[PDB]
Symmetry: C3
Subunit: 156 residues, 3 copies
């Protein structure tokens, strides 16, 4: 039936840096993770069926004093949903979300989630990927960090 995907983060895809990076490991076969009529290729969600899709992502970041220090008090926690063309490899942000945070001292725990959503016209061959800042602060739970898409209607 109509294409779709709901992907949960695989805790492998997370270095120990602050640099913005493409998340490359997502489950598509366990818990809430599912996919149909679309292809997952190392963090790249390829469209197989032309259409107007509703796209979305939810990203939680967290930090507990107990787990150690971090280079700085002030973080830029951002999420970018990117479209890339297998044909014309031009790459652009479909959506952006996030917040600057002062997780400064004398607080045992800090947490913050970001969500984005939107309706976009997609062509088979096009790929959707997720980039985030501070990926070492990501919350690994499946109810926490995910992204997905579902076709609403055909190209018109």
């Amino acid at each position: 039936a109509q294409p779709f995907a709901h992907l949960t983060i695989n805790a492998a895809s997370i270095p120990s840096g602050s640099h913005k990076v493409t998340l490359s490991s997502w489950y598509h076969d366990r818990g809430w993770a599912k996919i149909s009529n679309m292809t997952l290729s190392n963090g790249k969600l390829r469209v197989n069926q032309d259409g107007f899709y509703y796209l979305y992502a939810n990203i939680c970041f967290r930090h507990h004093e107990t787990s150690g220090s971090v280079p700085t008090d002030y973080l830029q926690l951002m999420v970018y949903v990117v479209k890339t063309s297998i044909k014309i490899p031009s790459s652009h942000n479909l959506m952006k979300g996030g917040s600057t945070k002062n997780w400064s001292g004398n607080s045992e725990f800090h947490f913050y989630s970001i969500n984005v959503g939107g309706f976009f016209k997609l062509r088979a061959g096009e790929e959707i990927s997720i980039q985030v800042s501070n990926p070492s602060l990501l919350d690994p739970d499946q109810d926490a960090t995910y992204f997905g898409a579902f076709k609403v209607q055909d190209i018109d």
Copy 2:
């Protein structure tokens, strides 16, 4: 026709504590609140028809110095969208969102909202409910705190 629900907060389901609780009272028949081919049973949204639904929630929290003061300098405003099943009961988190906030001195007025959304496969008999921390800080307005769902396609 296809099932759906948009439920608004009934200011009754609001204790005076900071412990996380399931919100049990939502309207389904005034203002923007509505429901069709779905059943609301004391805070639980039961699925009637099997399908792939888009689920969402928006939750607003606020605080006035005039109202008094916060339980602590550092607060944790969170939302959890929980799924349950007839027999074989088992609370399962579908999504979570939130932030840690320092609500003190600053301005007699503090506010923060959270939103979560996602595409899930659902079976008749399963129930969607909402839990939040600091429920006594909820914004009672129908445009501030609500949750809902709408079927997108049949199970496949």
Copy 3:
């Protein structure tokens, strides 16, 4: 086919005030901005076909110390999705989101994004618009600030 819109901010509709305003200039014809069987009239999205629609908005605010300073150390960064009508002079709030935030001159860069979404029953002639506080702090990129709608089903 079924109606929809995805509108992106036109940097014209941005005053230099802190006063809450209705954003009056959106693109419907370039980049990801698109519209089908809905009509844009200076900031309001008119519904032309009765239906149950999914509505959404993403708003991003940001500040560069190089741009000068913020009107207050503690800012109210809010968005309200409002419904008005071609006929009556009413004005109804459908969703609200936002946060109070300290951008107290220290860090050289501040950013914060908000997103809201919901399922609403709409009649031809009703119009959707966006109101935000601190409009001079809006991020003008098409992936940062937008709102839209897509019909899910006919009225019932």
